[PDB]
Amino acid sequence: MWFEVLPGIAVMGVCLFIPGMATARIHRFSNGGREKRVAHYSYQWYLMERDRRVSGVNRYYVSKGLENID
Amino acid sequence: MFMINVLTLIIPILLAVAFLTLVERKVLGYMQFRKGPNVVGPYGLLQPIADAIKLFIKEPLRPATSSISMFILAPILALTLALTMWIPLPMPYPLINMNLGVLFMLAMSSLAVYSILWSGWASNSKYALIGALRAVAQTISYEVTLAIILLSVLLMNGSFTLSTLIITQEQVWLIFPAWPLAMMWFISTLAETNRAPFDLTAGPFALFFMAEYANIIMMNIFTTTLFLGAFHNPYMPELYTINFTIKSLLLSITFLWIRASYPRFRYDQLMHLLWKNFLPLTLALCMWHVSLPILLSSIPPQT
Amino acid sequence: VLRLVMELSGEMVRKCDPHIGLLHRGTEKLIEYKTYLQALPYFDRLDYVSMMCNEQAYSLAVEKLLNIQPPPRAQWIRVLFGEITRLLNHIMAVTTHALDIGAMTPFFWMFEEREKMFEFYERVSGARMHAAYVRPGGVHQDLPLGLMDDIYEFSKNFSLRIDELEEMLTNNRIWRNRTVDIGVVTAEDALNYGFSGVMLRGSGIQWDL
Amino acid sequence: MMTYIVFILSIIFVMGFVGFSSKPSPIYGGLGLIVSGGVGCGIVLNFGGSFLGLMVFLIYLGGMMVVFGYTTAMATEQYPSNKVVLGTFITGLLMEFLMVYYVLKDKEVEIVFKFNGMGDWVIYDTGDSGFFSEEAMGIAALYSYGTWLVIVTGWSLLIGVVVIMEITRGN
Amino acid sequence: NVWAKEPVLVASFAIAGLAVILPTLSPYTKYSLMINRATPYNYPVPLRDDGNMPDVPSHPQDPQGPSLEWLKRL
Amino acid sequence: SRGEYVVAKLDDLINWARRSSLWPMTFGLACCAVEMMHMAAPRYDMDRFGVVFRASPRQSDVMIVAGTLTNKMAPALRKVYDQMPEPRYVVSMGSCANGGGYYHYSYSVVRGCDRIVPVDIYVPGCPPTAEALLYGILQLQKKIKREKRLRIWYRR
Amino acid sequence: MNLMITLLTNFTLATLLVTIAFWLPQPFSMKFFLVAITFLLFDLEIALLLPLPWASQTTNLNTMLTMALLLIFLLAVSLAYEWTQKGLEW
Amino acid sequence: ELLQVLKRGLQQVSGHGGLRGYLRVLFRANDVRVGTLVGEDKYGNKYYEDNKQFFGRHRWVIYTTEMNGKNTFWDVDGSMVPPEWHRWLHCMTDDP
Amino acid sequence: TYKYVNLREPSMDMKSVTDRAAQTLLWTELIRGLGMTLSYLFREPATINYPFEKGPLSPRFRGEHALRRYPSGEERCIACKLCEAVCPAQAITIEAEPRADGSRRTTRYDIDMTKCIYCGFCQEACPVDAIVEGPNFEFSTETHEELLYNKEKLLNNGDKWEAEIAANIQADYLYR
Numbered sequence A: 001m002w003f004e005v006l007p008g009i010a011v012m013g014v015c016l017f018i019p020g021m022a023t024a025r026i027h028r029f030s031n032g033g034r035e036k037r038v039a040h041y042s043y044q045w046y047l048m049e050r051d052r053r054v055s056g057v058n059r060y061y062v063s064k065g066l067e068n069i070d
Numbered sequence B: 001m002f003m004i005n006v007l008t009l010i011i012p013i014l015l016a017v018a019f020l021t022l023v024e025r026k027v028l029g030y031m032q033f034r035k036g037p038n039v040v041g042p043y044g045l046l047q048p049i050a051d052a053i054k055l056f057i058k059e060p061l062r063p064a065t066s067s068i069s070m071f072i073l074a075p076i077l078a079l080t081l082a083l084t085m086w087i088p089l090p091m092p093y094p095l096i097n098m099n100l101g102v103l104f105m106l107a108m109s110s111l112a113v114y115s116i117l118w119s120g121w122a123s124n125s126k127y128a129l130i131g132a133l134r135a136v137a138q139t140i141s142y143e144v145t146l147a148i149i150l151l152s153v154l155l156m157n158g159s160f161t162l163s164t165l166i167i168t169q170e171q172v173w174l175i176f177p178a179w180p181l182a183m184m185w186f187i188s189t190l191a192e193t194n195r196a197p198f199d200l201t202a203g204p205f206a207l208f209f210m211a212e213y214a215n216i217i218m219m220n221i222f223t224t225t226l227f228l229g230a231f232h233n234p235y236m237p238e239l240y241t242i243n244f245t246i247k248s249l250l251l252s253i254t255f256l257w258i259r260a261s262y263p264r265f266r267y268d269q270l271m272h273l274l275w276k277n278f279l280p281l282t283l284a285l286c287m288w289h290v291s292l293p294i295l296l297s298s299i300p301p302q303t
Numbered sequence C: 001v002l003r004l005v006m007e008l009s010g011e012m013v014r015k016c017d018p019h020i021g022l023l024h025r026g027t028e029k030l031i032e033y034k035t036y037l038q039a040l041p042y043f044d045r046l047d048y049v050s051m052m053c054n055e056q057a058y059s060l061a062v063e064k065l066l067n068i069q070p071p072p073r074a075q076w077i078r079v080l081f082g083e084i085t086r087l088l089n090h091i092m093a094v095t096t097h098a099l100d101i102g103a104m105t106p107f108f109w110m111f112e113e114r115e116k117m118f119e120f121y122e123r124v125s126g127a128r129m130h131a132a133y134v135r136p137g138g139v140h141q142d143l144p145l146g147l148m149d150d151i152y153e154f155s156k157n158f159s160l161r162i163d164e165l166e167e168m169l170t171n172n173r174i175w176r177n178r179t180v181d182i183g184v185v186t187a188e189d190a191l192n193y194g195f196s197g198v199m200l201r202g203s204g205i206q207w208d209l
Numbered sequence D: 001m002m003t004y005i006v007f008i009l010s011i012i013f014v015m016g017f018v019g020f021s022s023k024p025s026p027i028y029g030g031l032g033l034i035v036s037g038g039v040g041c042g043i044v045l046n047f048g049g050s051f052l053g054l055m056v057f058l059i060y061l062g063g064m065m066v067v068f069g070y071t072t073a074m075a076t077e078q079y080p081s082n083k084v085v086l087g088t089f090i091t092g093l094l095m096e097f098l099m100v101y102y103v104l105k106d107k108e109v110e111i112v113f114k115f116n117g118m119g120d121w122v123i124y125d126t127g128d129s130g131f132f133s134e135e136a137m138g139i140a141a142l143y144s145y146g147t148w149l150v151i152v153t154g155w156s157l158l159i160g161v162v163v164i165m166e167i168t169r170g171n
Numbered sequence E: 001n002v003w004a005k006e007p008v009l010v011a012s013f014a015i016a017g018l019a020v021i022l023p024t025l026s027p028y029t030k031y032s033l034m035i036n037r038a039t040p041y042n043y044p045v046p047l048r049d050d051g052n053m054p055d056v057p058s059h060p061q062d063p064q065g066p067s068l069e070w071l072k073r074l
Numbered sequence F: 001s002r003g004e005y006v007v008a009k010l011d012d013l014i015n016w017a018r019r020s021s022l023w024p025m026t027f028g029l030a031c032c033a034v035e036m037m038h039m040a041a042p043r044y045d046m047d048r049f050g051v052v053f054r055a056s057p058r059q060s061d062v063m064i065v066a067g068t069l070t071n072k073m074a075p076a077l078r079k080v081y082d083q084m085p086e087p088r089y090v091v092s093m094g095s096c097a098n099g100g101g102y103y104h105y106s107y108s109v110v111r112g113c114d115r116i117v118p119v120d121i122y123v124p125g126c127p128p129t130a131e132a133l134l135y136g137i138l139q140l141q142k143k144i145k146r147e148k149r150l151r152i153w154y155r156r
Numbered sequence G: 001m002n003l004m005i006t007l008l009t010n011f012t013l014a015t016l017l018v019t020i021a022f023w024l025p026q027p028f029s030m031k032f033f034l035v036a037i038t039f040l041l042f043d044l045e046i047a048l049l050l051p052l053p054w055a056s057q058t059t060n061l062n063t064m065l066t067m068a069l070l071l072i073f074l075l076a077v078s079l080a081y082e083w084t085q086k087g088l089e090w
Numbered sequence H: 001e002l003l004q005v006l007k008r009g010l011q012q013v014s015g016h017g018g019l020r021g022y023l024r025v026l027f028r029a030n031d032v033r034v035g036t037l038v039g040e041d042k043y044g045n046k047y048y049e050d051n052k053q054f055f056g057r058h059r060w061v062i063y064t065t066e067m068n069g070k071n072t073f074w075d076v077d078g079s080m081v082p083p084e085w086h087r088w089l090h091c092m093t094d095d096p
Numbered sequence I: 001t002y003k004y005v006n007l008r009e010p011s012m013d014m015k016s017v018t019d020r021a022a023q024t025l026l027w028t029e030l031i032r033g034l035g036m037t038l039s040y041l042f043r044e045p046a047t048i049n050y051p052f053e054k055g056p057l058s059p060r061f062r063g064e065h066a067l068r069r070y071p072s073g074e075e076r077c078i079a080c081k082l083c084e085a086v087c088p089a090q091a092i093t094i095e096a097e098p099r100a101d102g103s104r105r106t107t108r109y110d111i112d113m114t115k116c117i118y119c120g121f122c123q124e125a126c127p128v129d130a131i132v133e134g135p136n137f138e139f140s141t142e143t144h145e146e147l148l149y150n151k152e153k154l155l156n157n158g159d160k161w162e163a164e165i166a167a168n169i170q171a172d173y174l175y176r
């Protein structure tokens, strides 16, 4: 029966399962648990620029919360 | 890391296309009363491996060409289109977030029209030129339709990000407020991939082969984002990618399943059918999907 | 396999010369140099899809010339295999029409049923297709005991399967669109062009040999 | 791979215009205009370019050179490079070489102008609060303010349709 | 009548004509325009204080200005 | 001699790659074509052997000459033979085609398809029973298993 | 240049596939033309349509409805003109 | 009820003898239908007849290795049966 | 007697005409065809695993062209030339001689496998059942020289088996 076609679709679906999942893992690895920041407006990009400027490490993910206030 | 991202996209396409070819052979074998290929190893995964490496081995078409550079220049373009269409496709996180991606989809469909036409001119004697010319005609007559329909379904969501699309699919599937528009869209995807029930009756045959099947997987993934699917809780993307893969596979099996059982159309029936029936119906759905979001207080947050 | 030299105004026609004669084999000449019983299989294989009505017509030509009537069981068994042959030629002509019009799968459905029918020829004589088996003078070497019940089985299952063929096609919308408007035949055409059988059944006149 | 990538894509662009202004076979001409349109898309997207440069790509590299290649395929033969074509290609490369050499090692090159010769990071936005990609909202007019403009445009295209059917045997 | 012969065309005309008409009998179009107007892109710019006008409220809690309340209640 | 060892192993891989799929073209003149389509049928398979029945001449691995070759047929048959890639093999199927056959003593018949194209595999029968043809293609595959081209190239 | 990196990688790997596939083994009708021109003109009218989903958030909604219906209506009149007047017949 | 299948569907896997035994006839050519053990034969080869399959899958041979001596673990020919088994295997009878 | 087709009209009643319109605009019996095809998907297909399982036959197949011989006895053929007198492509070639004993026998008994259409006539014409169409049909011969049988090849092929031939004949020597 079609128990013998499910290996074919099984392996090919695993071949389609992989790229988004491994890509999302590389997204999370490229900013250390963060998600890569999307960028569609000038507003978001300027906020990202001041964020990567204030961080000191010139990197927009360290996210520098509440421990440089005073 | 970014070149690792690119190679993790365009390494599994060979796996996907080869195993899609054995899957179409198997599924037709069971729509028909056959089994196999299963003498080539267990169930035949080495069967696409074997015929792929055979077609590489087998001695090429001797030229017999006109402008060697043009003749190499057509299929290189076809395959690099089939690669460069999977960049803005989010399963949950796309490779490149864009301001607009669906117009990029349609643009690369038109470059596929270029592939067909260049291979047809640089091909051969005159009869294949007439055949490829009819093929370009019946391909280009549907990019009116599919662009129209894609426009009228994104007008429900107003923006072009496609991640706003995966947001706005969260409550209902988008098949419910647009079923006839989605139906006609799916028929136009059968037109663009140029399969049965639509006629086309080369070198290198592997490259045209590859572009065909990657075009099919392209349109299926784009459908599966576009009209159905489910939610995505963040910090768990295996969940959405699983449901995405399963729905796209069911749709591609349905695609080949529709291919299995219908005879090919007469050509003037195809053009006649497109113009006189899909074109006024598309205009009807466009004018109603314009005038209805202005009715039901439902205009999207196009940020 | 034919040769077709057509002359067309564009995506339309004007004329067509069917160059036939690719498959000339000299059958009449070879029968003029042989005997009757020896040269029966040439009559078996000039047509090949229908395959036992050719036998039947040659055997009736000789029996009618020779003024000898076969025994009645021979006549009824010959009628049975004429019906199997009629069934077989129409089912293959429908399926090759479907395969060449497109339509991959019903070809293979009905060819599995035809594979049962070639098993029946095998059990009758032994040959797959070109069983001679109909001598002038009636049928030779009658059936082995245990065949008629198999034909009974085939009748039941095949009625079910052909109703499933009309389930698939026939109110197929686009196959109807594909072949309705083409192929008109006037009754004067069906007489003057010398048509035979199914064309006469199809265009007007009630007619059966 | 550096700052003057806008200027370099412009070099390839004008090379493409020379590449089909040398008058080859018109299917090579369709090739030259496709390559030139691709790098023009690159230039305007470097100014960003967010919609209109992706919009031209569908029309010319999506719906116009298709029909030019179609008409090359159905009308003209070109059944077989030459002196004059490639000689003009050589002199066009020479003229661009001369102009860009004088832009490089001097101040400015003047046809009758003063082209202030350096690459263009000037000028650009000073990081403003755009928030809607001003191209997009600009073209998201024409349906409030654009009463007259789109009406005469669509009317012209309708008249184009009836014109085409008349010359190709109206009715 | 001709619904038997060319049916998808008559269906297309029907949905076309109702799409033409239907904003005339519509109790929601004013709601659509209020929604669409009441969403600000630019900065809500203030103004120089007073000819002592009983408008333009000072603390943003004050409901003397034009606010929205049909938003929260659908 | 692991150089020779790599030669033999790679030759096994490429020749198994050739003999694995082997999609044919069915030339199919007469009733031998009907029996070939009966080995295309659901009972005697061809998917199992990677064998895709296909009317394409441009990509033809083997070519199943079956039916009855005639004098009017022959130049068009060899023109079909020419536009074909050079790794190619021929199965002469049928008593008509592999030696003239029942129409041997006749005009307008080339006495077997030996006199046009070379033949690797003869398979007789009238028609060759579909089972027997499938056996003939299996012994074609074993001929492909013994071909030693890369052996000859390395020690050439 | 990030999508130019992607385009470069796809283009180079495609050229590697093709050239390693190649080092290794060794009249006309008017009816063809009218459909293409009808494509072209309806595609340009598509180009005039397609900034529609940009425009639907303004303070002039009735007018936008009216001229959008005018664009699709004019496109429909062109369609029905060549439809009735033997433009696509055989 | 799919748990009722793979419980039974493993009974032709381990009832063969093991998993490398299952791999034997799987990669040999095709079959996993083992379970009847009807009759072996000199020059090695064994003959399995099961009733619950249809007519065309009753009687199947399992070839052995080097009966004439030509490494016929792989590349199994036809006609590697003795003639009385060439009567039984071709469905000309109902008794072995 | 005749039972013809296509004699109706599309019914003008509102239910039937809107049903044909619903099929026109809703793609229905196309999906009915999809349902029938998926029903054939969910059957088990009928293939035979060829190199192991062999497709069924009759006791009266016509194959190998084998010879027979007497019980512990000599060659069954008298060389009575009937098979070459009937052979409808004349592929038999018999040249006969007596030997030193006195019983009339042969010299040259050749079957062309090319011309042999596999009738059965030479089986039926044989008075002593000398030539018998054999049971197995696997010839698959790589060279055209090798498809031309000699009498010694036929005797070896009649002595690679009689038991099949004897069982087939001893079952069905009663029909013919």
Ligand code: SF4
Pocket: C045, F030, F031, F032, F066, F067, F068, F094, F095, F096, F097, F101, F102, F125, F126, F127, F128
């Ligand atoms: S050998 Fe027999 S089956 Fe084949 S073409 Fe000749 S007559 Fe037909």
Ligand code: SF4
Pocket: I076, I077, I078, I079, I080, I081, I082, I083, I084, I094, I125, I126, I127, I128, I129, I130, I131
């Ligand atoms: S008919 Fe029989 S005995 Fe007579 S010559 Fe022929 S094979 Fe021999």
Ligand code: SF4
Pocket: I083, I086, I087, I088, I089, I090, I091, I092, I111, I115, I116, I117, I118, I119, I120, I121, I122, I123
């Ligand atoms: S089967 Fe027919 S062709 Fe063959 S040897 Fe006998 S009589 Fe001659």
